[PDB]
Design a protein around this ligand. Structure first.
Ligand SMILES: CCCCCCCCCCCCCCCCCC(=O)OC[C@H](CO[C@@H]1O[C@H](CO[C@H]2O[C@H](CO)[C@H](O)[C@H](O)[C@H]2O)[C@H](O)[C@H](O)[C@H]1O)OC(=O)CCCCCCCCCCCCCCCCC
Ligand SMILES: CCCCCCCCCCCCCCCCCC(=O)OC[C@H](CO[C@@H]1O[C@H](CO[C@H]2O[C@H](CO)[C@H](O)[C@H](O)[C@H]2O)[C@H](O)[C@H](O)[C@H]1O)OC(=O)CCCCCCCCCCCCCCCCC
Ligand code: CLA
Ligand code: CLA
Ligand code: CLA
Ligand code: CLA
Ligand code: CLA
Ligand SMILES: CCCCCCCCCCCCCCCC(=O)OC[C@H](COP(=O)(O)OC[C@@H](O)CO)OC(=O)CCCCCCCCCCCCCCC
Ligand SMILES: CC1=C(/C=C/C(C)=C/C=C/C(C)=C/C=C/C=C(C)/C=C/C=C(C)/C=C/C2=C(C)CCCC2(C)C)C(C)(C)CCC1
Ligand SMILES: CC1=C(/C=C/C(C)=C/C=C/C(C)=C/C=C/C=C(C)/C=C/C=C(C)/C=C/C2=C(C)CCCC2(C)C)C(C)(C)CCC1
Ligand SMILES: CC1=C(/C=C/C(C)=C\C=C\C(C)=C\C=C\C=C(C)\C=C\C=C(C)\C=C\C2=C(C)CCCC2(C)C)C(C)(C)CCC1
Ligand SMILES: [Fe+2]
Lengths: 438, 159, 71, 37, 27, 86, 31, 61, 304, 32, 34
């Protein structure tokens, strides 16, 4: 490695010594990617081993299995596990790829050349350069677009994806007409984030998701092609800072925002995160409890469970009035043009809807760090914390910390570009050249 | 003088009226220096309007010399606003007097210190001698890289 | 004056296990319950008493505690 | 559960997720052996 | 008139803050 | 008092660490910090003695007033209710 | 030699080891 | 043939442990990339073979 | 020059009594609107139906409250998470009855504090000093955002936010402890530790520096080393001041994160019924008395 | 419990790898 | 109330436009020394 005297960075800033070493940085990045896929494979195998297919996927603390299920592997209608082999093959494949990536990372980190500028001009960059960076960005944008189009291809020309809005419960459907209309796709972006409008978290049908992925894949491929053959415009040069720490700052800010968005989507959305796998959302649990009480007392005109909305729709009464924007596959059939349909609430309630509502009622998203499901005043009876709560909390924390990272690194990047990272000049400081404050 | 007691209070870090008079003196001194630089620039331009190119060049060079150190502009300039235009005038005046290498070096310094108006450089006639040296175009493309790589895209479209 | 030589690690490698085993035997043999009076898991509720004991006295505390502790 | 062919190797899987946490400790012990030069 | 005296005290505090901000003595 | 003490600790640490000189004489510029806090918040410290004495003074006064309050509670003398509201 | 630092270290340490052994033994029992 | 599959998987575990404990100590050592330039490389091939050895058997398990 | 030129020079001018950067352009009107509406609502505002059951709660000064009990009631429960501007209510009276001012104030105040955090960096860059005071300020603003914004999002209603008052703050804290075991949570423990350590280190640093006064950092370091047996730490003043900055900031970050996690119903430790006896008879512990208090608070908190 | 014993021995074997590598590099005289 | 809506939208748009143009106005950081 290197010491403090020859670099100026202490041990607790050791990685900062790799800014000007291309090969070392590449090796470190590859090793970290190997770590990521190692965790993916190991966790997949661990969750596969500790899996009881008879019970729902959310009663036991599974996180990656819901993902592989909603991709549509080994899932029958209603969420039953047909088989558990694809999960195993995914885990082992990720583990082997991790071994490969780790070997590459260690090799590039401590065998290969420190700087790739001389021997290999193609894989040679200087942060100050403004064209090679765009080339790299274009290559990686092409990779991301290829990944998105791979998802679309899987959902359109393979076994398909688990559509949870299929009649009679969710089922593995093959999308045959994704919505490519630009208006409906970008309406999600231009949508409000308050109340009934949930921004991109409000997406419901799988057709819109697939169409949006088509749009994003083609846009990313075109953007990569553009960036490979282009140099930033003069205003872009004047507005940004061109150094490694600045690029890291931009990435940190973007990834923190994405972490917040993922937290919100995991907590609220229930289509890309089907309730059969991740469990019911909080609003879903409350609405299901209200519906279950209503039907139980009906089989025993509002029926002491209905109420008028602030805008004038039939909604479930009680405190559940706050969760009156919820839409679910087991509740939409009973919905009418103006709120709930009284005639449909009185008849045509299939047993599967009642069973699903009862199941969701007892598994509301409540829990504790001690892993004791229920309210904070309840005794130790059952251990259950919903995967939705874990995902939301973890990714909110990560998003906040990465936003703090953007703040720190952007400040340091601007200071270093201006030449303030060391300190005050001690001979000609700006304050001594200023009129005294009145 | 008062610099001694300003250093004395600075060694302790108590601010006070000792720093205030030094601060005011520095502020007024820099203001009058900037005014003097502006009037020297005007005089140099006036003398350049009727030949006398060497005198104007000397005046502009003296203007460059009297530059504040560690300047921080209100808009984060890090350089005096007159500095870039005086550097460009150095480049122009030298270019009209041959010695193309140092002239393009001064132009490079001017573009480093700002002066984003690259079109003026291309359309300028006084820099015509600089057009002879390809190093002018080299420095320009180092500081103004065309956005579209036309040759690569044409070659790819050909195949 | 730090001295982490082998002499230290061999002189202190006999008494420390002795102390650990002494503590383990102190807990296991049951002397911990006898010395400190902590009730055993099968003595919290006796035959005559089936609720949390109450002191409700100051100068009679000794023999009252002895009586309500099952001894 | 795991397939029967890989059933006896289930205990090893039970420790697999923890190794990535150990790598930061490995970095720390490497720096300590280097004596934080 | 309790609201009146509460408001008067709060406005007095705000005025003291404003005067301290804008009418501080020079160093 | 306690929250103000925490605030003072954070402000002083961040301000000293962000006005250092590049390297008897002080290790940071008091003038720059004073200018910054005068143009951001409205008021700023100008004497090191006063700043550090204020840091000392705030938590001690807060805790002493809390102790007086607990002494009052010891005799059940409570600020429990507002008779007009009741 | 029975220096003051030796006395302090041993007085802090010996009960710590005894208590750690006791607590491990407590871990052994049911609860 | 689950028995031979398990035996081969134990061999894979052993060779993987040997590789992971040997590669860093033969790389970081001075001129360690030379003396074993093929030798260690050969082992990797074996490792690769081994996983495919436990691949095909899975189709016949 | 153009009018835009003079406007830009005045805005970015560093000679103003209070610096108003490009961030300040949004900070000033937002904070001014927030404080104006807050003052007007606190002094005089009709009772707010905080629960949406036609049982209004009054918090204004002219409706009976004194300074301690006065507050700006958070918006109604019928609104939920809906955006409620002054121009979507049926009437101004209806807007007041549903607690719109709370939403207006909280939105403008959050925007203002974010722009203030930006302005700190802007003026730090202008003066030529290292820009990390904004990072230190990021902790109280994060805590305020978690109190006012993230918790309503997790709970699904703005009515769960902190009321803009004193007695409202106490009610929010008590209800929060009832619903979530705030005290028995590691992140609140680190928050308390951070606050207490901040006060302790502030007092210690102030005392040491004001006592080492000449008519000497070495003398203070020697005294501290002889006092608390710490002979090999805090020899460098820069490291000492960095530790002073770091401790409370990290504590507040962690307590804000704990708040945000509880917003998604992830409460603290629940050591209820943990200690048992032979034949399965529960033996009470202190956590059980804490549970009894929480149960009382939760029972009395509800209204139907 | 054979399963627990195997788990513990596998854990110690897998965790001792890194310290073994760093010790070997320190003793032999590697780039460390 | 629509007039109030338009007024608020105009004010917010004006302030945001001023903010964006102001940050676009300034020049990038540069080290005069080296
Ligand atoms: C701008 C800042 C956020 C403002 C909006 C806050 C909010 O209420 O956002 C909520 C929205 C989601 O909105 C929800 O969207 C939902 C969509 O669900 C609907 O559609 C779903 C999909 O089918 C389901 O069917 C569901 O049942 C159905 O109800 C509902 O409409 C809800 O009523 C609605 O509230 O989140 C989003 O859009 C994404 C928002 C991401 C940022 C949110 C956190 C910001 C934290 C800032 C401070 C961080 C720390 C700073 C330190 C310095
Ligand atoms: C010491 C050992 C220990 O303490 O071990 C604890 C755990 C594992 O312990 C196991 O934890 C389990 C948790 O229950 C889970 O599994 C249960 C079924 O067994 C239920 O399905 C339940 O819903 C589900 O939560 C059970 O309680 C097991 O009995 C128990 O042995 O270690 C682990 O998980 C290791 C992974 C730790 C979490 C990694 C970060 C995840 C994001 C956390 C973000 C939190 C933010 C706020 C923090 C404040
Ligand atoms: C995942 C995070 C990560 C990654 C990828 C890196 C990567 C790197 N660091 Mg950084 N570092 C990190 C975390 C990380 N570090 C942390 C957390 C700290 C704080 C303690 C540091 C502190 C630090 C300092 C102070 C320095 C580095 C340096 C380096 C570089 C060379 C290290 C070296 O010579 O190894 C030598 C290592 C050894 C001799 C012993 C370890 C041997 C191997 C590599 C351990 C792993 C073996 C693995 C398990 C087996 C894989 C087998 C394979 C077949 C799959 C390298 C690019 C150095 C550098 O290049 O700077 C110029 C340097 O000076 N780092
Ligand atoms: C994005 C990741 C990435 C990048 C940019 C490179 C880039 C490069 N590698 Mg690396 N490499 C990688 C991943 C990567 N490799 C991985 C995952 C492995 C493991 C299979 C390797 C294994 C590897 C070897 C064994 C060699 C390279 C070599 C090279 C160079 C010629 C190609 C080039 C600098 C070659 C080279 O020029 O060595 C210096 C070479 O000998 N790489
Ligand atoms: C030919 C140009 C080229 C291409 C194609 C790539 C491609 C890639 N680089 Mg990049 N890279 C390049 C040049 C290039 N690089 C140069 C010149 C440098 C500077 C030396 C780097 C430096 C670099 C770093 C530092 C890193 C990469 C990484 C990666 C991989 C990220 C995969 C990923 O996570 O996507 C996610 C999406 C998918 C996997 C979906 C795609 C699925 C298939 C392909 C769809 C068909 C990807 C394969 C990262 C990595 O993990 O490498 C191991 C990484 O950390 N690259
Ligand atoms: C993560 C991937 C990525 C990254 C890092 C970049 C980064 C960059 N791109 Mg590329 N680009 C990408 C993906 C990406 N792009 C894709 C997928 C496409 C295809 C659509 C393009 C197409 C593209 C073109 C055509 C151009 C760039 C340009 C740029 C540069 C200017 C940044 C910018 O837009 O101004 C700062 C960001 C904005 C002004 C935001 C605009 C976003 C939309 C229009 C409005 C969003 C509103 C939002 C609320 C924020 C408003 C900001 C306000 C200023 C309007 C920068 C280097 C420009 C350049 O100079 O490069 C040659 C340029 O001309 N990009
Ligand atoms: C992928 C994102 C990324 C990348 C590549 C970097 C890269 C870098 N950072 Mg940045 N940073 C980031 C994110 C990132 N950082 C974030 C999110 C934060 C906010 C917390 C910071 C805060 C930060 C500071 C304050 C500093 C750096 C520094 C550095 C440099 C040296 C690395 C270092 O600290 O030594 C190697 C790493 C360590 C010594 C850290 C080991 C100890 C940590 C605390 C372990 C924590 C683990 C913990 C269990 C996580 C729990 C999370 C949970 C609560 C959710 C390097 C250029 C330093 C520098 O020199 O800047 C130029 C510096 O002073 N960064
Ligand atoms: C855009 C930003 C706008 C910010 C507006 C808010 C600014 C607040 C300014 C507060 C000034 C307080 C008086 C300082 C009085 C004063 O002149 O102090 C001056 C003092 C500096 O003293 P020197 O260093 O000059 O002392 C020299 C020695 O010889 C001693 O005199 O500054 C401080 O002590 C800093 C401590 C500030 C403490 C702030 C406390 C804030 C309390 C707020 C109470 C609110 C009540 C609300 C009721 C409704
Ligand atoms: C640079 C460096 C570093 C780091 C490094 C790293 C991070 C690396 C990584 C590496 C890696 C990341 C590696 C990986 C590996 C892996 C492997 C090698 C794997 C293997 C696998 C296996 C072996 C499996 C097996 C199996 C199966 C298949 C299933 C189940 C059963 C069994 C278990 C048999 C640190 C910072 C520390 C320090 C400094 C130096
Ligand atoms: C697939 C999907 C989808 C969609 C998607 C999309 C369509 C996306 C897009 C997205 C986008 C389209 C985004 C954008 C973004 C943008 C941004 C993010 C921007 C930023 C900017 C900035 C950051 C700037 C800054 C600045 C300024 C302001 C000025 C001064 C300078 C600076 C640079 C500082 C859907 C829903 C359908 C379905 C589901 C999923
Ligand atoms: C998964 C697996 C694998 C791999 C493995 C590995 C690679 C591992 C590694 C591991 C490691 C790599 C570990 C490390 C560790 C470390 C540790 C465990 C530590 C401990 C303890 C302690 C106590 C420490 C301490 C310290 C430090 C270090 C810091 C601070 C200072 C002191 C000195 C205190 C294979 C494929 C082969 C096979 C199968 C299984
Ligand atoms: Fe201090």
């Amino acid at each position: 490695g290197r010491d403090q005297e020859t670099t100026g960075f202490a041990w607790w800033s050791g990685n900062a010594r790799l800014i000007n070493l291309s090969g070392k940085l590449l090796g470190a990045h590859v090793a970290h990617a190997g770590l990521i896929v190692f965790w993916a494979g190991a966790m997949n195998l661990f969750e596969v081993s500790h899996f009881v297919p008879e019970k729902p996927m959310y009663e036991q603390g599974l996180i990656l299995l819901p993902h592989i299920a909603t991709l549509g592997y080994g899932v029958g209608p209603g969420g039953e596990i047909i088989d558990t082999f694809p999960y195993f093959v995914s885990g082992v494949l990720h583990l082997i790829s991790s071994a490969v990536l780790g070997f590459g990372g260690v090799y590039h980190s401590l065998i290969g050349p420190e700087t790739l500028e001389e021997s290999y001009p193609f894989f040679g960059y200087v942060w100050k350069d403004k064209n090679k960076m765009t080339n790299i960005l274009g290559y990686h944008l092409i990779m991301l677009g290829l990944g998105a189009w791979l998802l679309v291809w899987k959902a359109m020309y393979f076994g398909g994806v688990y559509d949870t809005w299929a009649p009679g419960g969710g089922d593995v459907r093959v999308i045959t007409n994704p919505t490519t209309n630009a208006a409906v796709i970008f309406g999600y972006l231009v949508k409000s984030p308050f109340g009934g409008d949930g921004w991109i978290c409000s997406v419901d049908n799988m057709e819109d998701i697939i169409g949006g992925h088509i749009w994003i894949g083609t846009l990313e491929i075109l953007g990569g092609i553009w960036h490979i053959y282009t140099t930033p415009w003069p205003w872009a040069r004047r507005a940004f800072v061109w150094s490694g720490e600045a690029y890291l700052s931009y990435s940190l800010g973007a990834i923190g925002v994405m972490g917040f968005i993922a937290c919100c989507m995991s907590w609220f959305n229930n289509t890309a995160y089907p309730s059969e796998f991740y469990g019911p959302t909080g609003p879903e649990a409350s609405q299901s409890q209200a519906f279950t009480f209503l039907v139980r007392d009906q089989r025993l005109g509002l029926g002491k469970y209905l109420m008028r909305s602030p805008t004038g729709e039939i909604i479930f009464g009680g405190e559940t009035m706050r969760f009156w924007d919820f839409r679910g596959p087991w509740l939409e059939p009973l919905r009418g043009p103006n709120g709930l349909d009284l005639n449909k609430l009185k008849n045509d309630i299939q047993p599967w809807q009642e069973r699903r509502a009862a199941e969701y009622m007892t598994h509301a998203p409540l829990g504790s760090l001690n892993s004791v499901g229920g309210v904070a005043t309840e005794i130790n009876a059952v251990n259950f914390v919903s995967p939705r709560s874990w995902l939301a909390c973890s990714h909110f924390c990560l998003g906040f910390f990465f936003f703090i990272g953007h703040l720190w690194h952007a400040g340091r990047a601007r200071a270093a570009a201006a030449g303030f990272e060391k300190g005050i000049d001690r001979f000609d400081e700006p304050v001594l050249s200023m009129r005294p404050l009145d | 003088a008062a610099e001694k007691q300003w250093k004395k209070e600075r060694a302790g870090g108590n601010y006070g009226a000792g720093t205030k008079e030094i601060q005011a003196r520095n502020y007024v001194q820099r203001k009058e220096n900037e005014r003097k630089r502006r009037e020297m620039f005007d005089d140099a331009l006036a003398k350049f309007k009727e030949n006398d190119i060497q005198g104007a060049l000397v005046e502009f060079e003296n203007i460059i010399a009297m530059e504040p150190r560690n300047f921080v502009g209100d808009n984060f300039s890090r350089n005096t606003p007159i500095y870039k235009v005086t550097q460009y005038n150095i480049a122009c005046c030298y270019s009209m007097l041959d010695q193309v290498e140092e002239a393009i070096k001064s132009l490079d310094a001017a573009m480093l210190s700002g002066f984003d108006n690259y079109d003026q450089i291309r359309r300028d006639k006084n820099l015509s001698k600089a057009r002879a040296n390809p190093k002018f175009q080299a420095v320009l493309d180092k500081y103004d890289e065309p956005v579209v790589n036309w040759n690569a895209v044409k070659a790819t479209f050909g195949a | 004056d730090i001295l982490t030589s082998i002499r230290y690690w061999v002189i202190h490698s006999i008494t420390v296990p002795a102390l650990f085993i002494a503590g383990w035997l102190f807990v296991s043999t049951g002397l911990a319950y006898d010395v400190f009076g902590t009730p055993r898991p099968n003595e919290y509720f006796t035959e005559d008493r089936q609720e949390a004991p109450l002191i409700t006295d100051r100068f009679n505390a000794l023999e009252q505690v002895k009586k309500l502790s099952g001894n | 559960k795991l397939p029967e062919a890989y059933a006896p190797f289930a205990p090893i899987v039970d420790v697999l997720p923890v190794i990535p946490v150990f790598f930061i400790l490995l970095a720390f012990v490497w720096q300590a052996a280097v004596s934080f030069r | 008139m309790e609201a009146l005296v509460y408001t008067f005290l709060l406005v007095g505090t705000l005025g003291i803050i404003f005067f301290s901000i804008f009418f501080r003595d020079p160093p | 008092g306690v929250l103000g003490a925490a605030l003072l600790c954070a402000i002083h640490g961040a301000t000293v660490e962000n006005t250092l000189f590049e390297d008897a004489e002080e290790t940071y510029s008091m003038v720059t910090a004073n200018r910054f806090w005068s143009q951001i918040f409205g008021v700023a410290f100008s004497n090191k003695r006063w700043l550090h004495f204020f840091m000392l003074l705030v938590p001690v006064t807060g805790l002493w007033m809390s102790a007086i309050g607990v002494v009052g509670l010891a005799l059940n003398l409570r600020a429990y209710d507002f008779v007009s509201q009741e | 030699i029975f220096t003051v630092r030796w006395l302090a270290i041993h007085g802090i340490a010996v009960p710590t080891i005894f208590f750690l052994g006791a607590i491990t033994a407590m871990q052994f029992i049911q609860r | 043939m689950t028995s031979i599959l398990q035996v081969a998987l134990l061999a894979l575990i052993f060779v993987s442990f040997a590789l992971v404990v040997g590669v860093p100590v033969v790389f970081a050592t001075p001129n360690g990339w030379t003396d074993n330039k093929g030798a260690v490389f050969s082992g990797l091939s074996l490792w690769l073979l081994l996983v495919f050895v436990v691949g095909i058997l899975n189709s016949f398990v | 020059s153009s009018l835009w030129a003079r406007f830009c020079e005045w805005i970015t001018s560093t000679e103003n009594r209070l610096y108003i950067g490009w961030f300040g352009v949004i900070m000033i009107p937002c904070l001014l609107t927030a404080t104006s509406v807050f003052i007007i609502a606190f002094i005089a505002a009709p009772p707010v139906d905080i629960d949406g059951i036609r049982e209004p709660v009054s918090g204004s000064l002219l409706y009976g409250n004194n300074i301690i009990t006065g507050a700006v009631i958070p918006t109604s429960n019928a609104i939920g998470l809906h955006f409620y501007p002054i121009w979507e209510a049926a009437s101004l009276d209806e807007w007041l009855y549903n607690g719109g001012p709370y939403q207006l104030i909280v939105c403008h105040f959050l925007l203002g504090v974010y722009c203030y955090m930006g302005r700190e960096w802007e003026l730090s860059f202008r003066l030529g000093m290292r820009p990390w005071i904004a990072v230190a300020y990021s902790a109280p603003v994060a805590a305020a955002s978690a109190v006012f914004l993230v918790y309503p999002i997790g709970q699904g209603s703005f009515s769960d936010g902190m009321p803009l008052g004193i007695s409202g703050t106490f009610n929010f804290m008590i209800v929060f402890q009832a619903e979530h075991n705030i005290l028995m949570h590691p992140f609140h423990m680190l928050g308390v530790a951070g606050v207490f350590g901040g006060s302790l280190f502030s007092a210690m640093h102030g005392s040491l520096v004001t006592s080492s006064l000449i008519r000497n950092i070495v003398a203070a370091h020697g005294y501290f080393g002889r006092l608390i047996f710490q002979y090999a730490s805090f020899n460098n003043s820069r490291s000492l001041h960095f530790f002073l900055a770091a401790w409370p900031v990290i504590g507040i970050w962690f307590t804000a994160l704990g708040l945000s996690t509880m917003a998604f119903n992830l409460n603290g430790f629940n050591f209820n019924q943990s200690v048992v006896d032979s034949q399965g008879r529960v033996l009470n512990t202190w956590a059980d008395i804490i549970n009894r208090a929480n149960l009382g608070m939760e029972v009395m908190h509800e209204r139907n | 419990n054979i399963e627990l014993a195997l788990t513990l021995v596998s854990l110690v074997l897998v965790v001792s790898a890194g310290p073994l590598v760093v010790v070997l590099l320190s003793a032999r005289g590697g780039n460390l | 109330m629509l007039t109030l809506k338009i007024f608020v939208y105009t004010v917010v748009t004006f302030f945001v436009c001023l903010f964006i143009f102001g940050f676009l106005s300034n020049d990038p950081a540069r080290n005069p020394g080296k």
